[PDB]
Write a protein that binds this ligand. Structure first.
Ligand SMILES: Nc1ncnc2c1ncn2[C@@H]1O[C@H](COP(=O)(O)OP(=O)(O)OP(=O)(O)O)[C@@H](O)[C@H]1O
Ligand SMILES: [Mg+2]
Ligand SMILES: [Zn+2]
Ligand SMILES: [Zn+2]
Ligand SMILES: [Zn+2]
Lengths: 48, 519, 624, 82
């Protein structure tokens, strides 16, 4: 149950039941980034 | 082993100053002032003499005097280190004092024409903390001080400013504002406003009649209300059962009359006599002003409760004029104070249970201006059923046209105007009567075996006679018991006798009136 | 050193005395001696047995008694009073070593043992505390007014070096100020460093607000309050509204920057807890055979009916109805397409001064899941569902009424006749469909409201009118009234003999309060076991009687010209028979139970009728 | 350089305990959950669900306190309101 959560269960897998009351709007997060340096013009990439 | 802090206390000055007469040429001198206390805070520690450690070197500087602000040392004592700004505080090895803040208000009789009351903040230290309660008249002796005030930035006029002199400095910006307000720091707090006579009173065997004839002397007649008010000032007994059921021991009275009757003089008498009493009116009072209100401290970190009429009348009598102009919202709080003796606060995330052990004196106008003798009591009043049930005595004042009574009444009224206060000659004075009431409240009567069986038959007499304007239930039996312990306290004895049961029964039966019917 | 040597302090203060290594070793050895050399009156190893029950449940906390430590070794008691913070670390290491000495490899099943002092002489009220009490052991009373959730606190912290990607080893957190590192041993740097959440071990944390109990506050003054911090096994013990006893340490919050903050230099205080104590329906195989034994005594029904409100005089019919609705029945689903409820509703209609609220109070102390709401008053719970904002956390919450909160239990509505339209709609929905619907703030849902209703109401005017039917004395409507099984009418009839006993009882109460019965404690548990495991049966040999009884009561009702009789009356008959049978922990509904049930419904119908109809019926139905 | 980058979707949800088996007189407690990619827009408020996830913390009065939250790894709905 939701009230039976303690310090033991931290970085561990739990199974929970309940009711949903909120759902926010979808946000954008990056997965692949391409960048450039504003002074010398060096280019590289990033993967998340 | 540390040294003991010493405090000096002066008192008994020649003159006492009013709050509306404080000037700025008396700053930093000794004076005594008067006022009424409204709000108090909890006791917190105060930094007095601190220990600091250097940050360039690690040296220890102890016993730095703070003097109303957070002062830091201005020179490392080592002749080598040249530190003057960088320090750290050892909170483990510093010496503290006790600190409380009190709020005061101007007394009612000292307010000028057309103006509103003034306020002032009082600081207490050491052993003077927790001597002032809310709703008290106290005299303070202390020193008139000034504290910073950033609320004045915006007022018209020239506001003084500070700067450093650049004439004399060799060269090849710190302006501070001088705005202050007047505050007060106290060293002495006092709350202001023989057996031979008491033992003489206890003996006289007409003491009850004299006490009745000493109440509200300015009012003419109306002896039933005078008896009721006395029994309400004396009180009953508070009991508790095995199951935690609480048996109530306060008497609640309601006086019913139209705007013609002299029903507000009774209330004004009680608010002038009794120790802890408050006078409130129906449409000049809000719910927060009756129960309580929550305000936040400037010091930060805590909150404070501010008392209302019901809390300022704890173990006392609350006076309400014009009970019929009360709202349902206020009446649900009054009912909570009457069934329970608690007030519940839930606002802004604060939960608190507060004590309201108070009696209710209330004056109500008939529903249609005048009292209809053909209707029942319920038909003439405008109260919620829960509130009406828990009132003990209902007194109705009706007018009669008799010539001799009119002559007496007119004589009395004119006498008071001609002769000032030499028109009363009461049996007892107010200072005499307070002492007797205080003595009487410390007796705890018990019932006797004759009393039990007399009560049973008196209850069966009431019930058979009621089969009217107000029907008889078990609540009336409990009211009978309460009134019995009230009369026993009036007689200053320790056990109830069947004679007092007769007076209680007669009083209750007389308070009831018969409904008039046509034909 | 020796024990009488320690009692000559040779330092500036107690704190600096206790931290010297030589005095710490001495006190650790002397604590080991206390642990392994105690003996009670008889001589039993008081702490030996506690340390073996430590093994079974595998707990992480140990209870110590200050009286014993004052008995044996007094300087330790003085140091415990003055500087408990330093003492408790030493005392907790000693306990852990002693436990390992009796349970090997317990450092895995648990890594630290906590000491909690049980008794302690001086007890303070919250208003007495002053600045002389700072950093000292205290014991206080109060009432719990607020509670927070469980947050994790750092215990064994691991750091990352963001140049060479290394995990720096366990570092300990003192519960005073946050710890920060400065040196990487592998790459030799003071660069950026961040805590590894995944490899860290945390601790339980919760905060509570304690208020002076209203009763003790001296006249004219207001209650004071303080804050309490609970760590590890102490979280979630005292729910709001209870009275507790706290043993802990009185400290200052080192607020922040004392600079700025113009004004006097004042500080705030907290209490850090060590032990909490309070100042049930679960049963066992010891009491089960006693249940079964009491169940075999003929006439358990009338014992139960007289063990109910054990402080209101007379009113047997209402007590019988209370027992019936406090035991219940069997809900039914016929192949997932037809439902007949199990709970039995009870309405009380009575004149002012007949003790209905007292029975409603009793039901709440006697029951497992019971909730209280008021129609026209001030209560901590309403009847309508809603979405509101939490003052503390600043969050939106879904809250149901007392009907939803009391699922599989009982709901107690006081002053039933003064409801507003909203409460009436909620009540009707709950009683009819047994589920609450809400469409607010994007939430569309249906909730379960399988609850029993008991209600109290006052007639119109104030007194009962016997010359008119029930529907014309009360302000409720037939749709709502028809959803109640049993109706009780309390009439204040002026009878000379009854007043004698009523007044006798009432006066005896006051006289005694001056400054058959089954015990309630067993009844409370019998009620839960019976309603958990007892599902009585309806074998149909006993169908012939009820068919012909219903036929007669239908033929009579139309002839006399009164309320109609519908099959809801027979359904109530059977549902009440279920309860009377379940009273005997039975296995097959008897005919005796059916006959007992029949009286309740027939009496209700007969007594809720006009005077003339009532005289006709009280003679016609004389056989039942 | 935004025209050369790729993105995904992330959502926040709050779960509440069943409003029925709650302590009497206390506000229900709730938890904050995070999900992304192929788990978004799968539920609506008012639904009773089974969630499998990881219990973790993030930093947001007290010496060292952290706020818990759950990373979603599965969703299963008891039954939906048609
Ligand atoms: N039959 C009775 N036996 C014992 N005590 C009784 C009885 N009838 C009334 N009382 C007592 O009389 C008082 C009645 O108060 P209570 O609020 O319980 O009555 P009520 O009928 O619920 O009130 P009301 O209908 O006026 O709102 C209580 O002290 C109660 O214990
Ligand atoms: Mg009631
Ligand atoms: Zn570059
Ligand atoms: Zn220095
Ligand atoms: Zn490194």
């Amino acid at each position: 149950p939701l009230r039976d959560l303690d310090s033991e269960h931290v970085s561990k897998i739990v199974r929970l039941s309940g009711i949903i009351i909120s759902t926010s709007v979808l946000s954008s997060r990056a997965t692949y980034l391409s960048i450039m340096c504003r002074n010398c013009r060096h280019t590289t990439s990033i993967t998340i | 082993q540390t040294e003991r802090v010493f405090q000096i206390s002066f008192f008994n000055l020649p003159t006492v100053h009013r709050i509306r007469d404080i000037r700025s040429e008396k700053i930093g001198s000794l004076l005594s002032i008067s006022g009424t206390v409204t709000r108090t805070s909890e006791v917190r520690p105060e930094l007095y003499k601190a220990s600091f450690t250097c940050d360039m070197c690690r040296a220890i500087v102890d016993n730095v005097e703070q003097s109303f602000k957070y002062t830091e040392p201005t020179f490392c004592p080592n002749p080598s280190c040249e530190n003057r700004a960088f320090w750290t505080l050892n909170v483990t090895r510093s010496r503290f004092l006790d600190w409380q803040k009190v709020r005061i208000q101007e007394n009612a009789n000292e307010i000028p024409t057309g103006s509103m009351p003034r306020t002032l903040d009082v600081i207490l230290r050491g052993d003077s903390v927790e001597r002032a309660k809310p709703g008290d008249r106290c005299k303070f002796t202390g020193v008139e001080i000034v504290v910073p005030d950033v609320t004045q930035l915006g007022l018209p006029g020239v506001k003084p400013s500070s700067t450093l002199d650049t004439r004399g400095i060799s060269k090849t910006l710190g302006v501070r504002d001088l705005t202050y307000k007047i505050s007060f720091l106290a060293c002495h707090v006092i709350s202001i406003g023989e057996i031979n006579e008491l033992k003489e009173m206890v003996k006289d065997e007409h003491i009850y009649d004299k006490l009745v004839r000493s109440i509200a002397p300015a009012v003419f007649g109306h002896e039933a209300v005078k008896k009721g008010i006395l029994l309400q000032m004396l009180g009953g007994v508070h009991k508790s059962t095995v199951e935690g059921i609480k048996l109530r021991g306060d008497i609640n009275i309601c006086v019913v009359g139209d705007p013609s009757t002299s029903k507000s003089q009774f209330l004004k008498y009680v608010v002038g006599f009794a120790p802890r009493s408050v006078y409130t009116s129906g449409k000049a009072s809000s719910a927060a002003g009756l129960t309580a209100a929550v305000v936040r401290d400037e010091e930060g970190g805590d909150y404070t409760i501010e008392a209302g009429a019901l809390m300022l009348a704890d173990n006392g009598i609350c006076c309400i004029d014009e009970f019929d102009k009360m709202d349902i919202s206020d009446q649900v709080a009054i009912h909570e104070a009457m069934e329970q003796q608690t007030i519940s606060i839930a606002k802004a995330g604060i939960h608190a249970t507060l004590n309201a052990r108070t009696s209710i004196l209330a004056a109500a106008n008939p529903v249609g201006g005048r009292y209809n003798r053909k209707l029942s009591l319920r038909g003439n009043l405008n109260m919620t059923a829960p509130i009406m049930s828990r009132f003990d005595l209902f007194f109705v004042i009706l007018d009669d046209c008799n010539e001799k009574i009119d002559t007496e009444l007119a004589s009395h009224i004119v006498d008071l105007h001609m002769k000032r206060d030499e028109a009363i000659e009461p049996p007892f004075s107010a200072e005499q009567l307070r002492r007797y009431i205080k003595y009487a409240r410390t007796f705890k009567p018990i019932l006797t075996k004759e009393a039990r069986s007399y009560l049973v038959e008196k209850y069966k007499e009431l019930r058979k006679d009621d089969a009217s304007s107000y029907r008889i239930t078990v609540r009336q039996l409990e009211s009978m018991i309460r009134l019995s312990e009230a009369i026993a306290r009036a007689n200053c004895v320790d056990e109830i006798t069947p004679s007092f049961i007769a007076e209680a029964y007669d009083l209750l039966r007389q308070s009831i009136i018969r409904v008039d019917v046509d034909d | 050193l020796t024990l009488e040597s320690l009692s000559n302090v040779k330092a500036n203060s107690y704190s600096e005395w206790i931290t010297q290594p030589n005095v710490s070793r001495t006190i650790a050895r002397e604590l080991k001696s206390f642990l392994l050399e105690y003996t009670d009156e008889t001589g039993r190893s008081v702490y030996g047995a506690r340390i073996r029950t430590l093994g079974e449940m595998n707990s992480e906390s140990l209870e110590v008694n200050y009286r014993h430590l004052a008995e044996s070794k007094a300087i330790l008691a003085l140091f415990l009073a003055k500087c408990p913070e330093e003492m408790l670390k030493i005392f907790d290491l000693v306990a852990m070593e002693a436990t390992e000495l009796h349970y090997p490899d317990y450092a895995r099943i648990h890594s630290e043992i906590h000491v909690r002092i049980s008794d302690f002489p001086t007890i303070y009220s919250l208003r007495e505390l002053r600045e002389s009490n700072l950093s000292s052991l205290v014991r206080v009373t109060g009432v719990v007014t607020r509670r927070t959730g469980v947050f994790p606190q750092l215990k064994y912290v691991k750091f990352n070096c963001l140049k060479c990607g290394s995990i720096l080893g366990p570092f300990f957190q003192d519960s005073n100020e946050e710890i920060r590192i400065s040196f990487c041993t592998n790459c030799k740097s003071k660069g950026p460093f961040r805590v590894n959440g995944e490899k860290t071990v945390y601790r339980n944390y919760q905060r509570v607000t304690l208020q002076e109990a209203p009763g003790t506050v001296p006249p004219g003054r207001l209650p004071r309050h303080r804050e309490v911090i609970l760590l590890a096994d102490l979280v979630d013990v005292s729910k709001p509204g209870e009275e507790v006893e706290v043993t802990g340490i009185y400290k200052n919050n080192y607020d922040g920057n004392l600079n700025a903050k113009n004004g006097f230099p004042v500080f705030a205080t907290i209490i850090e807890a060590n032990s909490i104590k309070r100042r049930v329906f679960s049963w066992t195989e010891e009491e089960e055979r006693e249940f079964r034994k009491i169940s075999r005594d003929r006439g358990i029904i009338d014992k139960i009916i007289s063990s109910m409100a054990p402080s209101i005089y007379g009113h047997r019919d209402i007590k019988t109805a209370v027992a019936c609705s406090l035991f219940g029945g069997v809900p039914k689903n016929v192949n997932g397409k037809h439902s007949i409820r199990g709970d039995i509703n009870v309405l009380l209609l009575g004149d002012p001064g007949t003790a209905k609220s007292q029975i409603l109070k009793y039901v709440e102390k006697t029951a497992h899941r019971a909730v209280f709401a008021t129609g026209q008053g001030a209560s901590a719970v309403g009847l309508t569902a809603s979405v509101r904002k939490d003052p503390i956390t600043k969050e939106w919450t879904l809250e149901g009424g007392a009907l939803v909160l009391a699922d599989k239990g009982v709901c107690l509505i006081d002053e039933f006749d003064k409801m507003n339209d909203q409460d009436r709609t909620s009540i009707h929905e709950a009683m009819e469909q047994q589920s609450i619907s809400i469409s607010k703030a994007g939430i569309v849902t249906t909730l379960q409201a399988r609850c029993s209703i008991i209600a109290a109401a006052n007639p119109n005017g104030g007194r009962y009118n016997s010359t008119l039917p029930l529907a014309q004395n009360v302000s409720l409507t037939e749709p709502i009234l028809s959803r109640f099984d049993i109706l009780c009418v309390v009439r204040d009839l002026v009878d000379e003999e009854a007043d004698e006993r009523l007044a006798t009882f009432v006066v005896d109460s006051h006289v005694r309060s001056h400054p058959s019965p089954i015990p309630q404690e067993l009844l409370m548990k019998y009620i839960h076991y019976a309603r958990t495991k007892i599902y009585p049966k309806l074998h149909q040999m006993d169908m012939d009687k009820v068919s012909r009884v219903y036929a007669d009561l239908r033929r009579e009702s139309i002839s006399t010209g009164s309320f109609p009789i519908t099959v809801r009356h027979l359904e109530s008959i059977l549902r009440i028979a279920e309860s009377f049978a379940k009273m005997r922990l039975s296995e097959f509904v008897s005919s005796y139970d059916l006959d007992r049930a029949i009286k309740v419904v027939v009496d209700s119908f007969v007594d809720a009728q006009k005077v003339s109809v009532r005289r006709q019926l009280r003679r016609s139905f004389a056989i039942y | 350089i935004h025209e050369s980058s790729k993105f995904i979707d992330q959502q926040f949800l709050k779960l509440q305990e069943i409003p029925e088996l709650v302590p009497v007189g206390e506000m229900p407690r709730n938890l904050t959950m995070t999900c992304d990619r192929y788990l978004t827009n799968k539920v609506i408020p008012g639904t009773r669900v089974t969630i499998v996830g990881i219990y973790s913390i993030y930093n947001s009065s007290g010496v060292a306190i952290r706020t818990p939250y759950i990373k979603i790894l599965g969703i299963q709905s008891d039954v939906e309101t048609s």
